[PDB]
Write a protein that binds this ligand. Structure first.
Ligand SMILES: C[C@@H](NC(=O)c1ccc(C#Cc2cccc(F)c2)cn1)C(C)(C)O
Ligand SMILES: C[C@@H](NC(=O)c1ccc(C#Cc2cccc(F)c2)cn1)C(C)(C)O
Ligand SMILES: *[C@@H]1O[C@H](CO)[C@@H](O)[C@H](O)[C@H]1NC(C)=O
Ligand SMILES: *[C@@H]1O[C@H](CO)[C@@H](O)[C@H](O)[C@H]1NC(C)=O
Ligand SMILES: N[C@@H](Cn1oc(=O)[nH]c1=O)C(=O)O
Ligand SMILES: N[C@@H](Cn1oc(=O)[nH]c1=O)C(=O)O
Lengths: 768, 768
């Protein structure tokens, strides 16, 4: 029923070219094909018809015998191609020794499933899916083109080079699109790429299907502006027509594939919508001798091609009245002046088709040479050409292609190849073209970023979220695509440990600038400078001057009656304690070290205790003599209890060594202090307070007595005031942080009031 | 060539049964298929051979015409089935009017692609993939079974019923497994299920492939304990063999499908590894007449089935001497006592097979009744049986199946069906069986959770992470599936409002008990009661009593001679001041409101001024008396001094109006006290300090002058004591936030010392 192109020969080679368009979604069941094709149709048919005659004319290839062909139309449809393939193998049920496989991957799979049953090798020129690399299922299938694994790698490289992270995905329903999108999704989601949503659609889908697909694509338009299309040319054209219908004229960047390549028939009429698209095209130089033969073809003389008259009518819209094919649908006639030179575009994969035919010829040549080296022709051992031997010879053959490079097949039947990255641009006014803006070879992507985006303002990068590495802010993911995150700044206490978590530093520590890491907060100590410490040391200096003056005035007047009243040694240890207190004041405000830290503690424990014990063991005799031991050796009765005092601090000392803790009152600052604790400091103060209570009780006992210049009342008043000076600082000491300056002040004031109200009257009048 | 089973008839019906096993991975190219099958092989062939004879015998169906058949072996392989299908259509190049399609989905697709080119209806009994529902690509395909969309729905229902979330997935490479797993993935990822990893493998893959697959499965073993297998019976058997080999004995839960169903040939020998697995099986009642016919078959008499001798020798391991198919591999001979009744198991999908055949017959009948109603037989308008008419009659035919229900086809060529959920359990010792533990019909999943997991301890649910929603802890997702989360506690300041983020209360609130919502922690005020305020109130009461007693004494003893030197009005001013102080302390300790601290400030200002202003001028007069306008100048001096302080207080109030602030010292607690500043509490305090200094200077001037019982000495005692108290409260005030209670104490103590050192000599002297 369907027509076929013949060429007589001793050996017949089949061919499946999509001369006509895929049947519409209505007429699929009738299996009637659409309009004729030029690039994928007549050009390839003429290419095969001419290359066979070139081979036949060549004496150095397939000598003494001729190569024929039986070219059939597959209409880019699996059913039509399967029917034509059945027509191929009808003889096996002149035999077809091999076919030049169809262009579509799914169609090639369908044809191979039938052909491998009859041992008919099949060489494809544009079938690209990875599924055809499985030699277990597709043993009799070979390619002159690489698989789409390299194409998926190239697409991922392109999306990676341009910061594209949040893209959408579209692929044509079938085997090429499906496998390509699976490979792309795998190797993209592996590295860094996030897909907004993957869509699939048939090439022959209606207008409504493409409209719905474009609406779904636009649902993510503000964020995902890049659409990775592992789609055929017709799918991309349908997308462009949908864009035109609903007024989208540059909101998307279409990233095409080998299906789009640099085809002018997929952007014609809709150039404005496809501008800025980036496509991948298998590298194949133009074939000059094909152009020299094709452009001189005329319908009157071209009889061996059954589709040439229809193509001539369809291209130059006209009617060939003289010939049986007229097609009066075209109103005007064709004058003998129209030529194929005008608006001639040679298809991209012409080299591949010629290479496939040459490959089959060379395989046949090798097999013939191997079988009968002597005979020049078809030997008796070659009349029943075996498909297995031909396949074996083809799998190892190597030759020189039309381009000039070496064509050879690997273990999977594929062939080496490199890609060109083309960009659809507007060059002039009302002029669009495909510009070669890069290449991809074995993982090396050499792109040129000046022709595409001839400026710094490129396409808005398809990113879900802006880079959120701005200082404090971290990144959290809400379960959806790991590229759509939300930004939360975390507390100044913590610093970022990774991009998704920030952790806290140690108890005493602060994050560094920009929270890159963590540092140690400097320990700010009580300095020898500062207002309060310098005031304290001034106080201590005044105190020392007072003590030395009083000691001098006592040494001058040793045995005077106005002095020799009580034990003189008690009124030596009192001044000793007074001096030691101010020595403690000096020792306290200092860098916390090992020696100073126990020196200050033993001093605080020992000084006021000694002085006030001396005062008590003076007043005891002083008032018991008038109320009704003593002698002069009361110094002992003091010392022993003072020794007890010493002993108890020994008990407190042995438990707590004079170390330094690093007090942390807040997260911001760090302080260092002595090893003094509540238990270690409340006991000596408790003992001192008991002594104070006894002294106060007994100063009350004596109060007013007639003595030498009335010491008793003044010392009682000093005791009274000291009792409350001690208590004043208690709230701002127990639990506070400045307990050192308070200790210095308390000791200073206590010493001053004790010295000023017991010594000053007596020695003052003595000097006066 | 391959052997086929013939049956003469007027109309021939093709059939493709997997009589032999799938060719091994090393024999695929030769297309030599393996050992014979019983359930999927001989049983189905015998079923068709007997069903056709039943139809021929039946006069009410297809009268006056006999039904023939040409049964061929597909070996469960696409290539072998395609070869057999080519042999079916070889006449078109007695015609085959229709085939009973193969069992596999991919094999059925391959056969349909070829059959639709010749208008040959194909009815499948077990092909269940969704892809075969597309009537555009598979117009001539019908089935008596539902698609696997319902099966994926059933699997998702089962995984969601037992709260399996982090399941793993395996499917057989092909069309049934692929489509089933895509459907399951969609339907499961939609609701709440996550897939640890999806794996694919061929049925005839080697031991190494299954070992690698099982190692990858065990890589998630502790967490992903349930495996959803959209796998064929042979894939499940291979998984079981791997489990036996590498020592897995029941730490996986295999969730089978229609491929597994309740097949005993996938768990034979490896029952221990498959125990506990849950499978889905299409419901099909056992056919009784088929059992009656089948169990009486003998190799001697059964000649029409060419595979019966081989099957007989394979099943009972023995050699048949009396027939050409000796197969001397087996040692022993076959005695005339072996019967098929022993260990007989009828396959699950037998009724479907019968139904398919019946459906075809019925359709033919209908079409005949539609074409030639009068003639009984094959009318002249029916000799070239038309595929389109037969398909159209099949698509609308409805009849009664062997089960008893009504078989009919919908618009997609499918048929209604329901599923049984079976469980592989161990009944006794060394005895395993498939137990019907549930069903699934049109979305309703009935199950028996007591039969599977007899105890409450079921299989450890496949969960990637334990429920983190308990208390303050929060869920954080990493860069992987959303069913695995890290459980991290966020601080007690924050409350969780969403399961993936928690936020802190603004300034003065706390999270509730449920950590859902801030609670606005209550404010704390001075709180009438408590020990300290009660003591303060007691002191205030004592002071008021003292003031009233002194005033009563003063007003009773008006112009007594001893009280004549001191100014009466100045004493009145003093008493008024002390009374105002004791009222101000009462006012201050209370709930803070506008009016309260509107006058508490003027109290704290005036009352000390009211007293000390009078006292200073009194002392000035008493000093001028000794050193050298009585009352007239003193009152105006008091006037101007009190007025200057009143003006200062008024200006401070005007410049800084009082408002009840809600100061927040920390996040934990909130306090309210009406606004005060450094100036607001220093300027009046500084003024009164100047007053105290002046009073101290003057009463030092007078010191111990002879007077009425030397009131100067009492004044000196008063100023000493007052200065001491004022200096005493500095640390507790300026070091802590207890402003109110310390102010109460200070005011009360100053007032009481002024009331003690004065007016006590007066009262106790004038009393005598
Ligand atoms: C600050 C603190 N005060 C003291 O822990 C303290 C310790 C020692 C002294 C003293 C003294 C002194 C007095 C006179 C002569 C002399 F040699 C020494 C005062 N306060 C408390 C109890 C919280 O008020
Ligand atoms: C807590 C603080 N005390 C006061 O801010 C203060 C304010 C007023 C008074 C008083 C009084 C008074 C005394 C006698 C009669 C009278 F009517 C009033 C005391 N202290 C300081 C100075 C740190 O001690
Ligand atoms: C984003 O692309 C730019 C060039 O367009 C370049 O900085 C780099 O390839 C990408 N940036 C990063 C951080 O990788
Ligand atoms: C599964 O569903 C929820 C999980 O929290 C629970 O209420 C129920 O008891 C679980 N188990 C079964 C057998 O439904
Ligand atoms: N690469 C495609 C072939 N191809 O698809 C088109 O749309 N044009 C074209 O040449 C395939 O592998 O099927
Ligand atoms: N629906 C299944 C049918 N089936 O698969 C098996 O492995 N056994 C069996 O009956 C398929 O499409 O393959």
């Amino acid at each position: 029923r369907r027509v076929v192109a013949h060429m007589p020969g001793d050996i017949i080679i089949g061919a499946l070219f999509s001369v006509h368009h895929q049947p519409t979604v209505d007429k699929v069941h009738e299996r009637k094909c659409g309009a004729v094709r030029e690039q994928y149709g007549i050009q390839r048919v003429e290419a095969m018809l001419h290359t066979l005659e070139r081979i036949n004319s060549d004496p150095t290839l397939l000598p003494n015998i001729t190569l024929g062909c039986e070219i059939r139309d597959s209409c880019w449809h699996s059913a039509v191609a399967l029917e034509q393939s059945i027509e191929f193998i009808r003889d096996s049920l002149k035999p077809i020794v091999g076919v030049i496989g169809p262009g579509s991957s799914s169609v090639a799979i369908q044809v191979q499933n039938l052909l491998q049953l009859f041992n008919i090798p099949q060489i494809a020129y544009s079938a690209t899916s990875m599924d055809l690399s499985d030699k277990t299922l597709f043993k009799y299938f070979m390619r002159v083109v690489p698989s789409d694994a390299q194409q998926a790698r190239a697409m991922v490289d392109i999306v990676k080079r341009y910061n594209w992270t949040y893209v959408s995905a579209v692929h044509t329903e079938g085997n090429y699109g499906e496998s390509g999108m699976e490979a792309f999704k795998d190797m993209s989601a592996k590295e860094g790429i996030c897909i907004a949503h993957s869509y699939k659609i048939y090439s022959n889908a209606g207008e409504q299907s493409f409209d719905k697909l474009l609406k779904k694509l636009t649902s993510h338009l503000p964020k995902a502006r890049v659409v990775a299309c592992f789609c055929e040319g017709m799918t991309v054209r349908g997308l462009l027509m949908a864009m035109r219908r609903l007024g989208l004229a540059g909101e998307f960047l279409l990233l095409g594939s080998d299906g789009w390549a640099d085809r002018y028939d997929v952007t014609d009429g809709y150039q404005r919508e496809a501008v800025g698209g980036i496509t991948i095209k298998l590298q194949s130089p133009d074939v000059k001798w094909f152009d020299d033969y094709y452009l001189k073809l005329r319908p009157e003389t071209n009889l061996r091609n059954p589709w040439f008259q229809e193509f001539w009518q369809h291209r130059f819209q006209c009617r060939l009245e003289g010939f049986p094919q007229e097609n009066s649908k075209y109103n005007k006639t064709c004058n003998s002046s129209l030529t194929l030179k005008t608006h001639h575009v040679q298809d991209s994969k012409m080299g591949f088709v010629i290479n496939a035919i040459y490959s089959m010829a060379y395989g046949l040549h090798n097999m013939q040479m191997s079988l009968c080296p002597g005979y020049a022709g078809l030997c008796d051992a070659m009349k029943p050409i075996d498909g297995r031997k031909l396949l074996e010879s083809l799998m190892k053959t190597a030759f020189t292609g039309v381009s000039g490079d070496t064509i050879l097949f690997d273990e999977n039947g594929d062939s080496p190849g490199r890609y060109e990255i083309m960009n659809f641009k507007e060059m002039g006014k009302d002029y669009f073209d495909y510009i070669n803006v890069g290449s991809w070879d074995n993982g090396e992507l050499k792109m040129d970023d000046d022709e595409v985006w001839s400026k710094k303002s490129n396409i808005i990068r398809s990113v879900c979220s802006e880079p959120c590495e701005k200082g404090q802010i971290k990144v959290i993911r809400k379960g959806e695509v790991s590229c759509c995150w939300t930004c939360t700044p975390c507390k100044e206490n913590e610093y970022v440990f990774d991009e998704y978590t920030c952790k806290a530093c140690q108890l005493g520590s602060w994050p560094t600038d920009d929270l890159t890491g963590c540092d140690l907060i400097p320990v700010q100590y009580l300095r020898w400078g500062d207002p309060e410490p310098i005031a304290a040391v001034v106080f201590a200096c005044l105190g020392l001057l007072a003590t030395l003056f009083v000691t001098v005035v006592f040494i001058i007047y040793r045995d005077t009656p106005v002095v020799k009243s009580s034990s003189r040694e008690l009124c030596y240890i009192i001044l000793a304690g007074i001096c030691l207190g101010y020595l403690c004041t000096f020792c306290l405000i200092a860098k916390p070290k090992q020696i100073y830290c126990y020196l200050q503690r033993i001093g605080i424990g020992l000084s006021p205790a000694m002085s006030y014990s001396a005062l008590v063991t003076k007043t005891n005799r002083i008032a018991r003599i008038l109320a009704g031991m003593s002698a002069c050796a009361q110094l002992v009765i003091a010392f022993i209890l003072i020794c007890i005092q010493l002993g108890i601090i020994v008990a407190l000392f042995i438990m707590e060594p004079p170390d330094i803790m690093h007090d942390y009152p807040s997260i911001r600052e760090v302080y260092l202090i002595c090893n003094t604790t509540n238990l270690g400091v409340v006991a000596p103060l408790g003992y001192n307070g008991l002594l104070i209570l006894a002294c106060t009780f007994y100063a009350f006992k004596t109060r007013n007595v007639p003595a030498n210049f009335n010491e008793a009342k003044y010392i009682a008043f000093a005791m009274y005031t000291t009792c409350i000076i001690w208590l004043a600082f208690v709230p701002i000491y127990f639990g506070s942080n400045y307990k050192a300056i308070t200790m210095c002040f308390s000791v200073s004031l206590s010493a001053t009031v004790l010295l000023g109200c017991m010594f000053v009257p007596k020695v003052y009048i003595i000097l006066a």
